[PDB]
Amino acid sequence: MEGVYFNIDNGFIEGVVRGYRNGLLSNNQYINLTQCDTLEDLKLQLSSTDYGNFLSSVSSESLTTSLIQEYASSKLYHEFNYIRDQSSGSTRKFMDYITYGYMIDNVALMITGTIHDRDKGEILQRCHPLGWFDTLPTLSVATDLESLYETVLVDTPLAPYFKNCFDTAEELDDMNIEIIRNKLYKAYLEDFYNFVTEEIPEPAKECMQTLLGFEADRRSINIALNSLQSSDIDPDLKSDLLPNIGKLYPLATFHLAQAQDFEGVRAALANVYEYRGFLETGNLEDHFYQLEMELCRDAFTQQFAISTVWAWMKSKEQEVRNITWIAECIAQNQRERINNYISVY
Amino acid sequence: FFGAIGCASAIIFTSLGAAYGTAKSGVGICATCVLRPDLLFKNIVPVIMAGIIAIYGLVVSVLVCYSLGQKQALYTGFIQLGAGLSVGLSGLAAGFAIGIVGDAGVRGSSQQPRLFVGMILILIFAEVLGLYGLIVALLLNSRATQDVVC
Amino acid sequence: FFGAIGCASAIIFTSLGAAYGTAKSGVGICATCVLRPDLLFKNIVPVIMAGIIAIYGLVVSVLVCYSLGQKQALYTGFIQLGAGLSVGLSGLAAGFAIGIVGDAGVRGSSQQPRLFVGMILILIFAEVLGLYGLIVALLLNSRATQDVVC
Amino acid sequence: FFGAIGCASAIIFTSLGAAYGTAKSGVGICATCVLRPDLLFKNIVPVIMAGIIAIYGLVVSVLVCYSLGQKQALYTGFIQLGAGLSVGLSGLAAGFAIGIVGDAGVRGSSQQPRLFVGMILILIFAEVLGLYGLIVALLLNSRATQDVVC
């Protein structure tokens, strides 16, 4: 049941998201765009959408690397940064937390990056609550954990980073890129779960519930596949073990994650999942995308729901990437490797 | 009296219902109309489905006024009360269900022009409760006030 | 006094139940129509199932009316009241159960059309409950009428 | 006496509903006005819809006031009280429905100017409640009242 509540606040966040979804690239468009190889045709399809605004500005029949990145950055400012500020209540909060959770991977990478020494300025696009002009640099200069805690308290509302810092004190996060990121993701998915649990009584989660679990299963099998034949430390959570309702089990994920080859698991898991277990790294990669792409669209059937807006954000990240992938091939007159091969969005 | 509470019950519960129903459905239509401005007319039958329920309920309420006195027998009251309840909460419940289905169905409409009529079918079933409650309630009320022998 | 409350329990709870049923079921059909737009025909057969509960609740009520007076009796009062309850809360519970399973079951419909009857085997378990209430309500009425005398 | 409280409760709820709607609708307009201020004129119509119910509320209130009695009984009390509920709650639920449609409808306007009229039509479904509610209360009040000790 949803729409069994009257909300001043939910009404604003839901309409503004619907307003964007109108001009937004449909499933049919993406299907048309792969077929293309004509420079002019790619422009036309896109001119007409939310992304089309930026395309019009500088008119380029062959789209280079830079143009694509600039258009996506522009597009995340109107759609995500802005929206939060004219939104209020529990609905603005839910948007802040999803944006901040994405920020925790980006900012974590910037901090870790200082330790390695690296060049900074503009950092590649993600959905972040405030740009790289506000929050991310202020967090970045503190590499000292003690000062991290203090810097999060200045941010009103609080970031997740405050908990993440508590943890890295007691050394449950260790060092090295791969292990940290696996723990940051484990927390990320854990926060999704706590929110649904509080949120559910007035806007139910049906479509969202199925998508959140299928997303979780995919993320974890993917992390495991990555650390299969590359080295894996067995007592660490580099297997991405996290609660589940029984769709993916801790045992079956652990078997895959270690270096012993455990391709079988994927096949047994699938009965309606796209990924079915293959010997081709590339074919696995294709399937992952299509699965996670489905059920977001289904979520749109619901409305007046926390379910709708969540599924939409996660679809947007997958569309910005599709645009990039297709656009570049057509530019230098080649066809797509991953996108031409996938056919279900 | 008790008959005045009957009047109250009928006009409150069926509006409160209808209002949700129309709201819910409405919001879903607002999405659909910008995507294809052709499905506008098809959209109009879900939202208004909850709209005919209301106009029924209101008719029972009007009835009850005419049936009202200033002070009347206990027996005349309690049937009057229980009648008004009936159309009021069946109105309330029907009005709610139809809106929830309705909203989700207008998106169904958006991808499937052809199946507008199928979304409609679901709605029409929830209406039997509202329509049956109107009937019963109208007959009860009229018979009720006769000042004993209700 | 107790006759009106007999009425209230029955006419609310069984409408709400049914209403709930249509709602959840509806939600499922509207989701499914975008993947498979030719499963309407099989889907509708769950939808109509929840609708006959209200019509029962209302017949029970109209009887409870005839069985009240104004002299009163605790003993007679209590049977009209106790009669309403039975159908209202069975109706309400059959209805809640049936829409949850229904909802989940149009997904079932989407992937595995051929075993659609299996969803139905599960649904028909909730409707037993409405019979159980109906049966007892009817009998309770036959005692109940005496015109509130001990 | 008990009539005055009627006047009071009535004009409050309908204001509450209408206030809510006016807010809801306003927040949506204020975002759109810094994104396209060319729709001010069209926008003004949804926000204002809410509150025209409230001018019916004032009319009923004044009439009842003029007809007040010094001392009242319970039975008579209940109708004048109850009348205030009628308008107040039809108001309360209508005002709420409208403001949700109202905010959602500014997006509709924004992409499709021409189908402004299709938004307006959803809103008019809720004005029915307001009128009929007002009508009904007027009658309940008139009967109870006969001036100076009702």
Next chain:
Amino acid sequence: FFGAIGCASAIIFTSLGAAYGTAKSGVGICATCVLRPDLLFKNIVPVIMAGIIAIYGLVVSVLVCYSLGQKQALYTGFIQLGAGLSVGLSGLAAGFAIGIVGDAGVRGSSQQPRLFVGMILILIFAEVLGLYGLIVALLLNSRATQDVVC
């Protein structure tokens, strides 16, 4: 009297118990069935355990109806009260239990087919409470029917 309310109590509590059972289980079964169509028959066999609860309740209820007095005081009232309660609480409690186990138990069905008889064993233990209630209620009934007597 309190005997008629004995009935009333039985049909509210035990309907709700079974409802919950079917609903919970429903959702687990529907899900699994799309991953594998062949566990239908296995999966249903839990669901039917909570469905026959209501039917033992129906036997107690019908029995009390025919045995209901034409004048009843405290001695009848209360022992009929207690009997109703008895089927009421076992139906309530067991129904609840069956649906949670049943639900988790489809996960059992799916991965291992032949440990279907093990799922049964768990389910059979909630059924103990169903018996216990129906027995007490019958013993209560028999003593109960005496009429009048304070």
Next chain:
Amino acid sequence: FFGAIGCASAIIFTSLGAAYGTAKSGVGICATCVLRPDLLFKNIVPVIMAGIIAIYGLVVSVLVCYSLGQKQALYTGFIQLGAGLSVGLSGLAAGFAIGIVGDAGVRGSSQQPRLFVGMILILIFAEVLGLYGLIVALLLNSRATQDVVC
């Protein structure tokens, strides 16, 4: 004496109303202020909208005080009571509505300081609800007059 409680009612509900508004608007002025301190003038206009509600209530309240006698009839109490109620809770509902529209519009100011005028017009529409409650309380007091309502 119930006039005292009348004064009392008005001062709680409206004060609450204003606080909510004031709170919301001010947080938006502070945000805007970091950017532009030349928009000082424009920002003051949204916040001041809430405070003026209470000044209509002050008039009503002071009126009631002076009208208090230690000879007041029950009917005299109720008029003052019903009047106080009207502005308190109208005050509640207007104040709240201005705070939502007010906050958002200060952010509108921030983005487009030329459209400060658009926000004004939006706000004045929530003010109307506040007037229609004030109006009836003033009128009621003033008409009732039994030697200046003692």
Next chain:
Amino acid sequence: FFGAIGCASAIIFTSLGAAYGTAKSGVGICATCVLRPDLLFKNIVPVIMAGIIAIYGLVVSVLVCYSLGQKQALYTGFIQLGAGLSVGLSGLAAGFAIGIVGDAGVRGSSQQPRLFVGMILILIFAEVLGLYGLIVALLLNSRATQDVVC
């Protein structure tokens, strides 16, 4: 009267205790059972403990029932009341604990055969509560009718 509530107490509360104990342990048992189809016997032991609680309850119920009556003394009434409660809530609380530890204990059977005995020992400690209640209930039974309802 209080006799009637006396029987009622004993049979209600103990059955919840039991019902819950069975459900909760069930979820754990189903889960383990598929990964190890050799540990069926071990898995069985937590669940069947909570079945035995009900049966002690059931003995007090039947005992108390013979001594049931409204035509009997206050001494009989009150003695039945304290007796019911005593086994009723101690039983509930033994089921609750048996059922949580029961779930929790499933990991201990599976990984560590040898320290399966620690789980069992924890359960055994939770059965004292039933005994503690039962013992008391009996003595009370003995005052109503000599030598524990001879």
Next chain:
Amino acid sequence: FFGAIGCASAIIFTSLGAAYGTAKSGVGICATCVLRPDLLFKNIVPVIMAGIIAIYGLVVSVLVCYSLGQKQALYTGFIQLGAGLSVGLSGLAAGFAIGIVGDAGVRGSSQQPRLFVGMILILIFAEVLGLYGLIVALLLNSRATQDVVC
């Protein structure tokens, strides 16, 4: 009496208003003070305003103490009581407004210290509520005075 409960009421609600005010702003202040070290002076002025409201609050209490007789009328009681509520709760709402606005202003302070006068100007607007209640409380207190025994 009811005068004493009036005393309580004033000083307790206004203390809560300021409490929350003082708190809210305090947290913001502490933050701003360890990153800037010349805005302490500015800071001091928002907090101290919510300390002065309570002093007005204290006055009404004292006034009511003196009007409290020995075995007064309820009629007398209600005027003293009603007066207390009025400063307390206006105080309470005035307090919410000062901290919420205040807090946001310390961040405002940090980037723009010259628009100090601007932050003040918002805070002043909340003082209206306090005036509105305090004035009325005074008139009520004075009149309520009627010595011992009424």
Next chain:
Amino acid sequence: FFGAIGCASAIIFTSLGAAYGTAKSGVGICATCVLRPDLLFKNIVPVIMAGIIAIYGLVVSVLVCYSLGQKQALYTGFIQLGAGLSVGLSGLAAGFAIGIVGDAGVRGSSQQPRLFVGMILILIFAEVLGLYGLIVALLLNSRATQDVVC
């Protein structure tokens, strides 16, 4: 009379406290057994700690059982009540503290078997609470008792 409720309060809360304790502690032990499978003999002592309160509780209960009359007084009566209170809810406070502590302390044991005695030592600090409650009941109970008719 009032004696039956003393008997009850006692046996109900002490049972529920001891359960909570035992349950919570159990969960911990079960995790600890698969974490380090030689801490068995250490584990066992926390769980059984809760439930030894019941044995002093049994004493007061058996006294109160024999002391029930046909009727009691109010003044005498309430000493029986108040005595039951003391043991039960104290037992509850002791059990709750021990079971949370219990669970936490087995984690201590798990990683460091050297601080095993220190874990125990915490439990006994919360056990003294339970001791005092028995004492205080005992003084009351002694005076209240006087077999039939108190």
Next chain:
Amino acid sequence: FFGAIGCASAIIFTSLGAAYGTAKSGVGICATCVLRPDLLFKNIVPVIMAGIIAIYGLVVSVLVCYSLGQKQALYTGFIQLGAGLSVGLSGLAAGFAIGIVGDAGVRGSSQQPRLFVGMILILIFAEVLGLYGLIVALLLNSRATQDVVC
């Protein structure tokens, strides 16, 4: 009577206020000692601010004792009751404010101990809420005693 309850209300609210204060601050302090283990001497002082609120609490309580009437009248009780309330809740609300500001202030000490002195002032400004209520409380108590059993 209600006077003994006076002693009670005061001692309880103000305890609660001061616990809050200590609780919250305390967690801050404990954070600060590992950042800075040398500014503890300063940190300790915020705690005592909230601790002095109770020492004021006790004087009222003691006061009420001494003034207790012989049997007390209904009016004598309420003055005393009301005084307990005045101080307790003004202490609670002041007490709440001191812990929250206190917390933010202790981390305040830790980073910059030079502007810890700004923090001290804000903390003192919450102590005045408690004082005005303590003043009032005196007055109510003093009134009770004059013309014994007032």
Next chain:
Amino acid sequence: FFGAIGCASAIIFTSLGAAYGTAKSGVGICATCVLRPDLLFKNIVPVIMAGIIAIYGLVVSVLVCYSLGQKQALYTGFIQLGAGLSVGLSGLAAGFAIGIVGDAGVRGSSQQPRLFVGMILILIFAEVLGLYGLIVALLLNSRATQDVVC
């Protein structure tokens, strides 16, 4: 007799307090001991600090018990009741503060173990909150004691 309920309360609420203090403390300590096991000795003094609360409560009870008799007149009872509450609820509230700081300071110990004493001192400050309450109960009790009207 109502005095029994003052005795009952004192020992309940205070014991609950001590319990709450131990529950919270326990979980913090057990964690600290696995991180650092050489801090055991220090850790153990804070927990046992809560439960010295229990000892003041027990004295209050014991005194009243012996002075109680079997028949009290009303007024002596109510003074005793109110004595019991004062310590009871201050105790409970003192337990909350003692436990929260308790937890936080053992984790602080782990990272820096030099201001372990400063942690402890905060907890000692919170013991005053019980003292002032405990104190009044003695005074109250001595005067109240006479039995059968003062």
